[PDB]
């Protein structure tokens, strides 16, 4: 005791938000850079390779949702203990999270492996290509524990204000994956399965770094040991109260993404899907800096909640919205001004430009509801974050998108407008709910 991250969490909230979110936004951007790169190599492999990825993709997102959920529940719980100066508690949460990483990770592997065959067959696919999907699935499912472990380890680092090493772990992993991708796919001629091995190997190396920090170097604020160790049902409940709704939040988005597609089909057709997919993929690029700010918000408000300092919690929460609002203003202005240039660099051109001229508007009010959810997780109330996510993406997004298409003259335009109007309302409601929760904290 202590570390720079702990001093950061216990210091100025405005200084904490900036110094924590920046490494997170960078780490997530490099991860996005990998997806853009991998999307290029695989695209030139054929229709059989793309069909194999699409079959395991929902399963992949399922693993990620569970891994990231356990991670944020870990970071939130650790941040609150450190704020409350509960050293033994923070140490105990870290140990619990690592044990859960083994339990959750291996369970995913042993559950999906024998079920991955009939799953691909049920999704209207005979193999042929489904057989290629299994081989691709085996590799990634083999490292399900590695995935969850890396998210937990990253969660521990974020929990004690160590966004630096957390960023490093993300950069090393995605960076190595960017390197191995063309080598495994083309140079070695492994095809699309090579991309799986490249990902698996990059994850393993990342784990070797994390394990070295946590178990070998042991230079972390929290102390990790099984001596003598004691199972805590309160710590388990504290992690799952944030972790589980965090995973279900991703399920809500995925379900919502499915219905938004169906509405885009009826508008619509394959032409409507192509435009929506392209417009959404570009728009969600500006979401990345908001996510990094959300991860910082959870840790800072969590530490402030542990310190029983509502003023510090409110400051960090409102300051995170302010910065993210300014960033999105630059992002939205860039996209709308240079829409034909952006559409040209990612390619239905006429419909895509109009979509980019209307859709990314919601990014402006997005931070108002996303930081509220982030601070809800920070104080340990993940259920409110789940309810807010369900309301935003299922009730508002799908709701308004279904109305402007089936009840109005607007075609594809009604889809973008519905998504924009929908979550902007949820942004106001979410923000208002945040002010009510903070007012209740002052009285408590």
């Amino acid at each position: 005791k202590t570390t720079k991250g702990v001093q950061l969490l216990r210091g100025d909230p405005k200084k904490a938000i900036v110094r924590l979110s920046i490494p997170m936004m960078i780490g997530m951007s490099v991860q996005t850079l990998y997806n853009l790169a991998d999307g290029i190599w695989v695209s030139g492999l054929g229709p059989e390779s793309l069909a194999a990825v699409g079959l395991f993709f929902p399963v992949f997102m399922g693993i990620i949702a569970l891994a990231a959920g356990l991670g944020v529940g870990t970071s939130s719980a650790i941040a609150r203990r450190i704020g409350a100066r509960d050293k033994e508690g923070a140490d105990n949460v870290a140990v619990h999270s690592l044990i859960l990483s083994l339990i959750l990770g291996v369970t995913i592997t042993i559950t999906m492996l024998p079920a991955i065959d009939s799953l691909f067959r049920s999704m209207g696919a005979k193999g042929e290509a489904v057989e290629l999907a299994i081989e691709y699935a085996r590799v990634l499912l083999a490292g399900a524990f590695i995935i969850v472990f890396n998210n937990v380890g990253n969660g521990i680092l974020r929990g004690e204000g160590d966004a630096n090493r957390a960023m490093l772990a993300m950069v090393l992993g995605s960076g190595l994956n960017i390197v191995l991708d063309p080598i495994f796919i083309y140079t070695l001629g492994f095809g699309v399965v090579g991309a799986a091995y490249a990902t698996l190997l990059s994850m393993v190396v990342t784990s070797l770094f994390i394990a070295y920090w946590l178990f070998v170097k042991r230079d972390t604020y929290v102390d990790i040991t099984l001596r003598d160790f004691s199972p805590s049902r309160e710590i388990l409940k504290d992690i799952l109260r944030v972790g589980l709704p965090s995973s279900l939040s991703q399920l809500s988005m995925s379900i919502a993404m499915f219905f938004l597609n169906s509405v885009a089909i009826t508008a619509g057709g394959e032409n409507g899907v192509a435009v929506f997919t392209s417009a959404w993929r570009i728009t969600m690029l500006g979401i990345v800096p908001i996510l990094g700010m959300a991860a910082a918000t959870t840790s800072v408000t969590g530490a402030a909640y542990g310190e029983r300092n509502v003023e510090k919690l409110e400051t960090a929460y409102l300051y995170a919205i302010k910065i993210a609002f300014m960033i999105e203003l630059a992002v939205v202005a860039f996209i709308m001004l240079f829409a034909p240039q952006v559409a040209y660099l990612f390619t239905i051109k006429g419909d895509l430009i109009s979509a980019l001229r209307t859709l990314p508007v919601f990014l402006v009010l997005t931070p108002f509801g996303m930081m509220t959810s982030a601070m809800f997780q920070g104080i340990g109330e993940g259920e409110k974050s789940l309810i807010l996510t369900i309301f935003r993406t299922l009730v508002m997004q799908v709701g308004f998108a279904y109305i402007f298409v089936h009840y109005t003259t607007l075609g594809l335009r009604g889809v973008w407008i519905g998504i924009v109007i929908g979550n902007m309302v949820a942004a106001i409601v979410g923000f208002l709910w945040g002010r009510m929760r903070i007012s209740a904290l002052k009285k408590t």
């Binding site: 997530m28 991860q31 993709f57 997102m61 990231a68 993300m170």
Partner: peptide, 10 residues
Amino acid sequence: XVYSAVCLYV
């Protein structure tokens, strides 16, 4: 990437 579920594939 792996630490953020909502991206998603691209």
